[PDB]
Amino acid sequence: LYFQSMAARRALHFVFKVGNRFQTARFYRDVLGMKVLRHEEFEPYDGKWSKTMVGFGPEDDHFVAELTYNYGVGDYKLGNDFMGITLASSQAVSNARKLEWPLTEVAEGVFETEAPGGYKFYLQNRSLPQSDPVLKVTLAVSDLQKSLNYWCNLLGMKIYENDEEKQRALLGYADNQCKLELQGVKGGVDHAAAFGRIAFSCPQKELPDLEDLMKRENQKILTPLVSLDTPGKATVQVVILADPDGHEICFVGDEAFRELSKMDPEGSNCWIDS
């Protein structure tokens, strides 16, 4: 009935598959200027793995990167599904130049770089005091109208920009949150092996409403309501969806997620090269 219309929605993070942890530490810490917020070790990949949340500040008020490492997996073929994270940091641009991390000005004051694995980061050469540098995540879509119907009419995001000519829309749950940019492409959306997942929270009571809505609307549920455990921390509940182009989406219950996502004060000891 009302899942599409509730106010309490928050963009959390994007999940990246990491093959090369040492170069990844160099990129996120020394180029971007991000820090480790929390790091956890867990005992289509079956073995040991680790999750490192990295960003510009606590997950309560920042959009962060979830870095996933599967022990024994050194490479993930990157498709054309993820088109970049855009952040405002002249310092990151300065860091790249000082470290000779390759970068290219691709639009006025916007410098394109790649994280290890090939994931695009667009660094706007400016500083925004008080606020999260992370501005948007861009994903490729095959049919923008279909994607808008799903992200706006079902998931309830609002439209900030809609450029019909360029087949590009900018969506968000609030003015102060990271935005999701949908960019129409020709040739199909290929997720290959490095595909990620974008996560949002909502009150836990609404998770079954989300599932009901997606069933009613004949949309894909990858994982029905399930509880996930993290050693020594709070158990959370998630529903995992796929959007019309197969992009993975996690909705997590916000109250438990806030307990889980407390920022660790000793995070920096957790970089692999520390």
Curated annotation (Swiss-Prot):
Modified residues annotated as Phosphoserine in this record: S127
InterPro entries, alphabetized: GLOD4, GLOD4_C, Glyas_Bleomycin-R_OHBP_Dase, VOC
GO MF annotation list: cadherin binding
Tissues expressing this chain: Expressed in heart, brain, liver, kidney, pancreas and placenta. Not expressed in skeletal muscle and lung.
CDD domains (alphabetical): GLOD4_C
UniProt xrefs under Gene3D superfamilies: 2,3-Dihydroxybiphenyl 1,2-Dioxygenase, domain 1 (3.10.180.10)
Pfam family membership, one: GLOD4_C
Subcellular location: Mitochondrion
UniProt keyword Repeat, yes or no: yes
Misc remark: Expression is decreased in hepatocellular carcinoma samples as compared to adjacent non-cancerous liver tissues from the same patients. Transfection in hepatocellular carcinoma cells and overexpression can inhibit the cell growth.
PANTHER family: GLYOXALASE DOMAIN-CONTAINING PROTEIN 4
Protein name: Glyoxalase domain-containing protein 4
Source organism of this protein record: Homo sapiens
